[PDB]
């Protein structure tokens, strides 16, 4: 068959290395490739010497998986740095951060237009659906707003800042306190979070109260105050959320079924309204 090797990038080709304030502190950095002349991001362990050989294989495993899963809506890996001095994963740089920031930093982004929100939800489904259609199927099991990255034109790139795979319980289905019905549950909560710009279980301080409540069937509140009546396709989106976070995992739809129903919804938006939505947030961000 047709096989292709991932490039090995020398450490001294990464210029202007700077820490980034994301993921675990001291695990994500930005830089520039001296030859390709593009901005990049570098994911790495905490800095120490010597790097264990068991630690190197942990990084190569994540890199091999991200290499196998290359797709239009998945964070593109560019290569790996494997030397005695440094050990990291180099990917493309997403300039506009994560969906977490866009939703809840209401001063930098006072308004987020509906067409952009619906396209974001659409592209999130496209990336995960591609992961599930692989052989063997790839399961994320960590879908949250912090893992949804946005590129130069606010297109979705799905990523994973965690390191152990190779508050934070609000995206977990109740049966958790193999297993393909996990990601669609996280997606239902993200959909509610996008359409509301509110924190799920805002007034609940103790996480044990959250875990107990969702185990009894309680979900984030859906009323006029959380989801106003002027949301486009409000009735159809609520049916998707409620079926997405169903108590019984067998009653949750696949990401394919969601995409089939999302296609006619997104089609009712004019194509130009997407660009005008992106030009607006970048304009409001100019004066800040
Ligand atoms: C302001 N802009 C930024 O700060 C920025 C930082 C940035 O840093 C990184 C973030 C993540 C990763 N790595 C990663 O996403 N790996 C991975 C592995 C398996 C799966 S498959 C499903 C699953 O298992 O979750 C998957 F989807 C993803 C990385 F290498 C670098 C990248 C872009 N922009």
Author numbering: 5 to 170, 188 to 198, 206 to 316
What's the paper's own text on this?
RIPK2 is a caspase recruitment domain (CARD) containing kinase that has been implicated in nucleotide binding and oligomerization domain 1 and 2 (NOD1 and NOD2) signaling. NOD-RIPK2 interactions result in activation of nuclear factor κB (NF-κB) and mitogen-activated protein (MAP) kinase pathways to promote the transcription of pro-inflammatory cytokines. This signaling pathway potentially plays a crucial role in an array of pathological conditions including inflammatory bowel disease, Crohn’s disease and multiple sclerosis. Herein, we report the design of receptor-interacting protein kinase 2 (RIPK2) inhibitors based on pan-kinase inhibitor regorafenib that aim to engage basic activation loop residues Lys169 or Arg171.
We report development of CSR35 that displayed >10-fold selective inhibition of RIPK2 versus VEGFR2, the target of regorafenib. Two RIPK2 molecules were found in the asymmetric unit. As expected, CSR35 was bound to a DFG-out conformation and retained interactions characteristic of most type II inhibitors. The pyridine nitrogen and hydrogen of the amide formed hydrogen bonds with the hinge region (Met98). The urea was engaged in hydrogen bonds with the catalytic residue Glu66 and the backbone NH of Asp164 of the DXG motif. Engagement of Lys169 was consistent with the predicted result from sequence alignments and likely accounts for modest inhibitory activity differences between WT and R171C mutant RIPK2. Since the carboxylic acid will be deprotonated at pH 7.4, this functional group potentially forms an ionic–ionic interaction with the activation loop.
